[PDB]
Design an enzyme around this catalytic site. Structure first.
Site, PDB file in Angstrom:
ATOM      1  N   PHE A   1       0.819  -1.229   0.000  1.00 55.90           N
ATOM      2  CA  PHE A   1       0.000   0.000   0.000  1.00 55.90           C
ATOM      3  C   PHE A   1       0.860   1.290   0.000  1.00 55.90           C
ATOM      4  O   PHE A   1       0.438   2.305  -0.564  1.00 55.90           O
ATOM      5  CB  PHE A   1      -0.925  -0.010   1.232  1.00 55.90           C
TER       6      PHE A   1
ATOM      7  N   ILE B   1     -10.354  -4.678   4.443  1.00 59.11           N
ATOM      8  CA  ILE B   1      -9.020  -4.636   5.030  1.00 59.11           C
ATOM      9  C   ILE B   1      -7.994  -4.334   3.940  1.00 59.11           C
ATOM     10  O   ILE B   1      -7.973  -4.985   2.902  1.00 59.11           O
ATOM     11  CB  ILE B   1      -8.717  -5.885   5.896  1.00 59.11           C
ATOM     12  N   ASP B   2      -7.176  -3.302   4.184  1.00 56.20           N
ATOM     13  CA  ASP B   2      -6.126  -2.806   3.295  1.00 56.20           C
ATOM     14  C   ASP B   2      -4.994  -3.818   3.150  1.00 56.20           C
ATOM     15  O   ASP B   2      -4.872  -4.743   3.961  1.00 56.20           O
ATOM     16  CB  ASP B   2      -5.553  -1.475   3.832  1.00 56.20           C
ATOM     17  N   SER B   3      -4.156  -3.621   2.115  1.00 59.05           N
ATOM     18  CA  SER B   3      -2.981  -4.447   1.838  1.00 59.05           C
ATOM     19  C   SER B   3      -1.898  -4.270   2.935  1.00 59.05           C
ATOM     20  O   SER B   3      -1.230  -5.243   3.300  1.00 59.05           O
ATOM     21  CB  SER B   3      -2.443  -4.182   0.427  1.00 59.05           C
TER      22      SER B   3
ATOM     23  N   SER C   1      -2.627  -3.214   6.203  1.00 62.51           N
ATOM     24  CA  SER C   1      -3.214  -3.741   7.437  1.00 62.51           C
ATOM     25  C   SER C   1      -2.823  -5.202   7.629  1.00 62.51           C
ATOM     26  O   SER C   1      -2.328  -5.562   8.696  1.00 62.51           O
ATOM     27  CB  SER C   1      -4.733  -3.608   7.415  1.00 62.51           C
TER      28      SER C   1
END
Ligand SMILES: OC[C@H]1O[C@H](O[C@H]2[C@H](O)[C@@H](O)[C@H](O)O[C@@H]2CO)[C@H](O)[C@@H](O)[C@@H]1O
Ligand SMILES: OC[C@H]1O[C@H](O[C@H]2[C@H](O)[C@@H](O)[C@H](O)O[C@@H]2CO)[C@H](O)[C@@H](O)[C@@H]1O
Ligand SMILES: OC[C@H]1O[C@H](O[C@H]2[C@H](O)[C@@H](O)[C@H](O)O[C@@H]2CO)[C@H](O)[C@@H](O)[C@@H]1O
Ligand SMILES: OC[C@H]1O[C@H](O[C@H]2[C@H](O)[C@@H](O)[C@H](O)O[C@@H]2CO)[C@H](O)[C@@H](O)[C@@H]1O
Ligand SMILES: OC[C@H]1O[C@H](O[C@H]2[C@H](O)[C@@H](O)[C@H](O)O[C@@H]2CO)[C@H](O)[C@@H](O)[C@@H]1O
Ligand SMILES: OC[C@H]1O[C@H](OC[C@H]2O[C@H](O)[C@@H](O)[C@@H]2O)[C@@H](O)[C@@H]1O
Ligand SMILES: OC[C@H]1O[C@H](O)[C@@H](O)[C@@H]1O
Ligand SMILES: OC[C@H]1O[C@H](O)[C@@H](O)[C@@H]1O
Ligand SMILES: [Ca+2]
Lengths: 532, 168, 84, 27, 97
Positions: free
Chosen positions: A67, C37-39, C41
């Site tokens: 991210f 849910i983010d990468s 996280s």
């Protein structure tokens, strides 16, 4: 004092007459081959040290940054309106009081042979500060126009919203990421800071965005157990510190980086030795000493700074009361614009502290990020006390952390997080009151930026004065709040989930946007009233 | 300069009378006057230029981006020929940044040049104190830039020539 | 060793890394779609289990563990090593 | 052994980049 | 006890007038009280500065404690809330002098 050699006598000159004054040639220096060697070698040596640290999580295992490289960039109705305000301000809005000083400083910078403070301290340099002044000096070569010169500052404002909306808020938690009011308050407070305080050549925009980048780099290097992003943060923090004296707010972002650094270094230590993981960060720290001292010698800088303090205006840690006493003046430093920005960030900070006390953290919030945003804001506000001059235009340092606290405060005050209606009502009464107190000045901007603007030298008033109307509404909200305290009212029975109700539960976004509009409307209506 | 516009007089009028009553016996209420004038006005830009060294106050800067401030040589400054400055109160309160005590140019010019005020007017905002313009003429005009005998000489880190003098 | 113990274990790391309630931690829900849910996280949740419990999921196991149920299946199948 | 290829260059370059920067103003 | 000598007129008339004539500062001018506390004077003396700041620190930690836990631990719920309550109200009610 020498302004030359003056004689009212004329004709032939005789032998004996010899005036030989040695001009104070110090500061007029260029690096020695040896000094240039250690710089180019040492700065490349740091990249070599940090390149060795980069392969250490790649050596410990894991897939490349998921991210942290780039989040999917796009547009949003809000992203348009933000950049609309940003870009319109760039033309119609009021600039800083010092952008002239900085311009003329950078303008003469090149021929001079060094970055001398042109208007004061007997031509002594900026010594550690104003490295981007050299960059502004290069930029002047293209053109010298408020629109050209303030253009990196326009891009910084945009870069700033970007960082807040795409890097900060998604990291802040589920409620932050999902709540649209959290994005509206974030934009509202950020713009309430950026527009009046950062439209110019001052270091504030560079620092306001620099503190966000430091935070992001730690925040992203803490989640990936990678030490390089923690070292990158240090460099961002070191560069913003020496942006201007007002750079110490960056110490906020830096000190907070200590906690996760001992966490990343002790968890990913994996029997590598302290010397292997810390030497490249120790290099990352010292790497700004190449920039700071690129043209001036230690003695030169130290001697000049100790003089600049002695001679000119220098104030103490315990003098910071002035900065706030200036904020309450019926003046351009005590302007509605400036009062509101600070007052509201304090309210945002207060409700965030208070929530983090009642509950463990803000209910819908990610533990670590939120605590570190409040952290950086608390430390930053205190760090500020050490500046040699106490102006309100320094509050523009808070522009980054304002967005982040806007998000948090909104999330902390939502129906789900703040469960008492009576409590949500008193919070509203507070937002009305900071605005009541904010409308108790002049809508004044300073210099030529004050030309024909509405209430530029008067209390914004329609039929009774905004300050009185807002205070009455603020007392009205309290009576409603006091009624809930005796009636026992909840989220569902007070009214049935309409749009007018929806708006009212986001008072910061209402109040902040109200003011963002008012400030842009006021400086447009300024240009309008200055017709030809 | 007492100001009023040509537009405020109709084309019907062709002759003018300067009348000025006064009735305060108090020691300081009083009036002085000169004959009327239709000033031959040329904008600052075409008058001062952008090749002439000027003493731009730290305040007036983004406002006068074209006009160039006096560059500084090797301890010596380019002598300013003009001085653009903010409004009365703006200079009354912000000019001390450059005063002799502070070591600013306003202290160097205070000794070298004689400041003559040239009258100035704002575009269409006739009654607004935009600021001020000054013509800076040297006391010894026969005098011209110095004979600077400058030469290269490398110096150490901790090295300091002479102490920096604090003004009073 | 139970499903509840694994679910409640991942539930506290989910409300620490993300702002997601432990109630939302059920075997049906998929991180990247149902929970959002983010990468980043995921990496933090993984590095927290590596610290708190001493368990590491290297070779893109995060990609394989779509739902919270898929995670139960992983760590239940690890109890064979007898580290308790 | 134990990934010492980066371990030695991180120490020798990390200490040198620090030392040079501290030296830089005194030059 | 208040109107024992003078009438409603007498008192009401004097008050609005003393407000016109004399030094009258609005609720928003309360910043001055504090601005004055940091002056290098008997108003901002080591004695007045310490009093206020220490009361503020005492009240800060009290709110802080009552927010974290339900009340300050070893204390009565009602009487302790009422002392804090009066202090907050008094500081604000102060802005109207
Ligand atoms: O006085 C304002 C100016 O001071 C700066 O120098 C500081 C210097 O940062 C600090 O090390 C020294 O102790 O005192 C002076 C305090 O003035 C610069 O001279 C200017 O850039 C500041 O505006
Ligand atoms: O009047 C007492 C002294 O005040 C200052 O001392 C400050 C200093 O300026 C501050 O920035 C630093 O952190 O240390 C002391 C703490 O008071 C002046 O330095 C002194 O000149 C004054 O005498
Ligand atoms: O006392 C003079 C001030 O009043 C005006 O206020 C106007 C306002 O500008 C405008 O939006 C609208 O016409 O209503 C108010 C008056 O009700 C000027 O705008 C101020 O600049 C003057 O200072
Ligand atoms: O007690 C004085 C009352 O007047 C204030 O308002 C002032 C103030 O200057 C400003 O709001 C307005 O523009 O003019 C009035 C008259 O001076 C307060 O709003 C009142 O509540 C004050 O108590
Ligand atoms: O100016 C300070 C004095 O003003 C008071 O007068 C009050 C008045 O009594 C109050 O009822 C009215 O509402 O406002 C004015 C002042 O704004 C006192 O009479 C004085 O004793 C105060 O010291
Ligand atoms: O480093 C920033 C640069 O700008 C400063 O100008 C300060 C002005 O701000 C106040 O409003 C005025 O009193 C003051 O002249 C310089 O001090 C500094 O070098
Ligand atoms: O104390 C728990 C509180 O949560 C809500 O914040 C508040 O309203 C409620 O009282
Ligand atoms: O009440 C006193 C009033 O005076 C002014 O009319 C208004 O501002 C204020 O409300
Ligand atoms: Ca007279």
């Amino acid at each position: 004092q020498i302004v030359g050699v003056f004689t009212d006598l004329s004709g032939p000159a005789p032998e004996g007459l010899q005036l030989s004054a040695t001009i104070d040639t110090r500061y007029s220096t260029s690096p020695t081959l040896l000094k240039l060697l250690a710089m180019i070698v040492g700065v490349a040596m740091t990249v070599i040290a940090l390149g060795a640290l980069h392969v250490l999580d790649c050596a410990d295992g894991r897939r490349h940054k998921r991210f942290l490289p780039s989040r999917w960039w796009s547009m949003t109705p809000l992203d348009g309106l933000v950049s609309a305000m940003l870009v319109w301000w760039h033309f119609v809005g009021a600039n800083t009081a010092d952008d002239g000083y900085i311009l003329t400083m950078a303008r003469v910078s090149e021929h001079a042979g060094y970055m001398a403070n042109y208007y004061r301290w007997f031509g002594t340099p900026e010594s550690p500060f104003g490295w981007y002044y050299d960059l502004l000096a290069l930029w002047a070569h293209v053109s010298t126009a408020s629109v050209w010169m303030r253009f990196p500052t326009l891009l910084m404002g945009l870069a700033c919203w970007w960082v807040i909306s795409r890097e900060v808020i998604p990291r802040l938690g589920a409620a932050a990421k999902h709540s649209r009011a959290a994005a509206w308050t974030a934009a509202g407070l950020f713009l309430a800071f950026w527009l009046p305080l950062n439209n110019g050549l001052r270091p504030e925009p560079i620092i306001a965005l620099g503190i966000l980048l430091t935070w992001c780099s730690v925040e992203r290097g803490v989640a990936t157990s990678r030490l390089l992003p923690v070292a990158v943060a240090i460099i961002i923090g070191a560069l913003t510190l020496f942006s201007g004296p007002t750079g110490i707010a960056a110490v906020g972002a830096l000190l907070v980086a200590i906690g996760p650094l001992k966490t990343i270094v002790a968890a990913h230590v994996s029997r590598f030795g302290y010397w292997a993981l810390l030497a490249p960060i120790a290099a990352a720290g010292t790497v700004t000493i190449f920039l700071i001292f690129r043209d001036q010698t230690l003695a030169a800088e130290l001697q000049a700074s100790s003089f600049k303090s002695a001679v000119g205006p220098s104030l103490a840690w315990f003098d910071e009361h002035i900065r706030y006493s200036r904020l309450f003046t019926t003046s351009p430093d005590g302007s509605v614009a400036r009062r509101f920005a600070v007052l509201t960030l304090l309210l945002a900070l207060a409700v965030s502290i208070a929530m983090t006390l009642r509950k463990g953290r803000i209910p819908g919030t990610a533990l670590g990020p939120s605590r570190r945003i409040i952290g950086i804001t608390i430390i930053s506000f205190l760090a500020m006390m050490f500046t040699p001059t106490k102006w309100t235009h320094h509050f523009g340092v808070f522009a980054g952390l304002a967005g982040c606290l806007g998000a948090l405060a909104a999330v902390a005050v939502t129906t789900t997080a703040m469960k008492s209606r009576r409590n949500r009502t008193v919070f509203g009464a507070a937002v009305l009151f900071v605005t009541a107190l904010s409308f108790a000045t002049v809508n004044g901007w300073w210099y030529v930026s004050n030309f024909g603007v509405p209430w530029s030298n008067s209390f914004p008033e329609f039929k009774f004065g905004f300050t009185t109307m807002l205070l009455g509404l603020s007392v009205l909200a309290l009576l409603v709040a006091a009624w809930f305290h005796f009636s026992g009212r909840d989220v569902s029975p007070d009214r049935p989930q309409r749009r007018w109700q929806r708006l009212l539960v986001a008072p910061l976004a209402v109040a902040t946007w109200a003011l963002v509009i008012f400030e842009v409307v006021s400086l447009t209506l300024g240009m309008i009233n200055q017709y030809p | 300069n007492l100001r009023a516009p040509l537009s405020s007089i109709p084309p019907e009028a062709t002759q003018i009378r300067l009348v000025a009553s006064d009735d305060d016996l108090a020691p300081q209420h009083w009036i002085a006057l000169t004959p009327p004038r239709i000033p031959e006005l040329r904008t600052l830009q075409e008058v001062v230029g952008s090749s002439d060294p000027v003493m731009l106050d730290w305040l007036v800067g983004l406002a006068f981006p074209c006009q160039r401030p006096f560059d500084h040589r090797y301890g010596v400054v380019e002598v300013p020929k003009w001085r653009i400055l903010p409004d009365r109160f703006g200079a009354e309160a912000n000019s001390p940044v450059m005063d002799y005590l502070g070591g600013g140019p306003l202290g160097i010019t205070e000794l070298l040049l004689r400041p003559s005020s040239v009258p100035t007017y704002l575009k269409d905002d006739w009654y607004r104190d935009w600021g001020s313009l000054q013509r800076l003429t040297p006391w010894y005009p026969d005098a011209q830039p110095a004979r600077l005998d400058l030469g290269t000489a490398t110096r150490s880190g901790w090295w300091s020539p002479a102490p920096l003098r604090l003004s009073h | 060793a139970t499903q509840e113990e694994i679910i409640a274990g991942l539930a506290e790391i989910i409300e620490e890394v993300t702002g997601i309630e432990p109630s939302e931690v059920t075997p049906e829900k998929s991180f990247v779609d149902d929970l959002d849910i983010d990468s980043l996280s995921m990496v933090e949740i993984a590095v927290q289990t590596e610290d708190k419990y001493g368990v590491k999921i290297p070779d893109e196991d995060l990609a394989g563990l779509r739902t919270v149920g898929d995670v139960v299946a992983y760590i239940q199948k690890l109890e064979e090593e007898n580290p308790e | 052994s134990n990934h010492r290829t980066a371990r030695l260059v991180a120490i020798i370059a990390g200490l040198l980049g620090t030392l040079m920067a501290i030296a830089t103003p005194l030059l």
